[PDB]
């Protein structure tokens, strides 16, 4: 098990330190690797550490920037990155080097680098419009607008509704604030008898709102 750290937000110029805690195997016998993944690009190798000896191998591109340490008695490899620029916004994985393949990998830590400030979302009902009657299928949704940072969690009827739900990827507007839509498809008839509520929770703001979407 390689349990990595939480989502990390940061301003340009700053620095960040993110852990990768290991369990099971004997931490000192295996090099720990750190790979960067940035949307629209592949996987980039940053470097590795041998915690038994602390010798390290760095990719040239990250030499002045990343630093790999390992507090051996605590089974936690670390990595700080320095002078964060917009291009370090990405997902960082640590993975164990078994020898000829990376075999385990931690879930990722997302770092967002931006000058922008936390903003909770405004939630707006996208009321059962189009085909609502003459269709047999009606679509309803919530518009989760102007929030920063990612992520937001939208769910319908406290989880009691899954079928037909399409929550779309957040898009980032000119203002550097994101917005998304969660839309659900229901049979036109249900509109008179059910109540559709979407539940939006944005934790970096501690925003939890529920919205009825009535036709």
């Amino acid at each position: 098990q390689l349990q990595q750290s939480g989502t990390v937000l940061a301003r340009p110029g700053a620095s960040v330190k993110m852990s990768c805690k290991a369990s099971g195997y004997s931490f000192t016998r295996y090099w720990m690797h750190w790979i960067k993944q940035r949307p629209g690009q592949g996987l980039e190798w940053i470097g590795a550490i041998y915690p038994g000896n602390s010798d390290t191998s760095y990719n040239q591109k990250f030499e002045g920037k990343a630093k790999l340490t390992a507090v051996t008695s605590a089974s936690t490899a670390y990595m700080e990155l320095s002078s964060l620029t917009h291009e370090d916004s990405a997902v960082y994985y640590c993975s164990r080097d078994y020898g000829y393949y990376f075999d385990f990998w931690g879930q990722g830590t997302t770092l967002t680098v931006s000058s922008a400030s936390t903003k909770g979302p405004s939630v707006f009902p996208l009321a059962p419009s189009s085909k609502s009657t003459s269709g047999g299928t009606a679509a309803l949704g919530c518009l989760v607008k102007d929030y920063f940072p990612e992520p937001v969690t939208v769910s319908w009827n406290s989880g009691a509704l899954t079928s037909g739900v399409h929550t779309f990827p957040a898009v980032l507007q000119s203002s550097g604030l994101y917005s998304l839509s969660s839309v659900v498809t229901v049979p036109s008839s249900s509109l008179g008898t059910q109540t559709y509520i979407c539940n939006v929770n944005h934790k970096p703001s501690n925003t939890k709102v529920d919205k009825r979407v009535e036709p």
Partner: protein, 210 residues
């Protein structure tokens, strides 16, 4: 330092088809490995030492190659195999760009819904009009907004889902954002959709008063 180039970068394939993806090593390298990643998970060990499949990798996958060209072939494409495939080499620790593999299915024309601004958004002075193209294939769809039957440019954004798991269709939303002032100057808001599975483009409209 060894640069790996993968081709194709996107590939659609019907289940039962045979796919083959390349990863070419710029400088002759001894062993090639291959990782698979599905949306929202870490890479998984798939092929290693040019052709040994790891433990779990079903019989249909197959590494092959020497020096500068390696390949991953799937014999009978299955629906569960759609993912991005990256090849990896151990001297520079480089990886190649990925080959996303999607499943081909039959053309399915979008249902288009359109939604007017809620009142709550309007009191706060902005107006977002959403147009939804629901469950379709291929992913290529073209959505044009017209306000008082005149085309709009530069003030919409769209987001597309990743291919549905049991269905294989995409969904796309396009949002037009206006100030309340601008919204109120115009009357007919229409979403025009062009897509393969449509003999003529669907338009869906609402009129601001009505």
């Amino acid at each position: 330092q060894i640069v790996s180039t993968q081709s194709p970068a996107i590939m659609s394939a019907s289940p039962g088809e045979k796919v083959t993806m390349t990863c070419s090593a710029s400088s002759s390298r001894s062993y090639m490995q291959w990782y698979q990643q599905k949306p929202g998970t870490s890479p998984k060990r798939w092929i290693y030492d040019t052709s040994k499949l790891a433990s779990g990798v079903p019989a249909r996958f197959s590494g092959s190659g020497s020096g500068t060209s390696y390949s991953l072939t799937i014999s009978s494409m299955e629906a569960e195999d759609a993912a991005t495939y990256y090849c990896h080499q151990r001297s520079s620790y480089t990886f190649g760009g990925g080959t996303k593999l999607e499943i081909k299915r039959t053309v399915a024309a979008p249902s288009v819904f359109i939604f007017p601004p809620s009142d709550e958004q309007l009191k706060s002075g902005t107006a977002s009009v959403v147009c939804l193209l629901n469950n379709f294939y291929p992913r290529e769809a073209k959505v044009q907004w017209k306000v008082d039957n005149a085309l709009q440019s530069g003030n919409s954004q769209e987001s597309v889902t990743e291919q549905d798991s049991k269905d294989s269709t995409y969904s796309l939303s396009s949002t037009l954002t206006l100030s309340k002032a601008d919204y109120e100057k115009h009357k007919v808001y229409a979403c025009e959709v062009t897509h393969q599975g449509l003999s003529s483009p669907v338009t869906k409209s609402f009129n601001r008063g009505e």
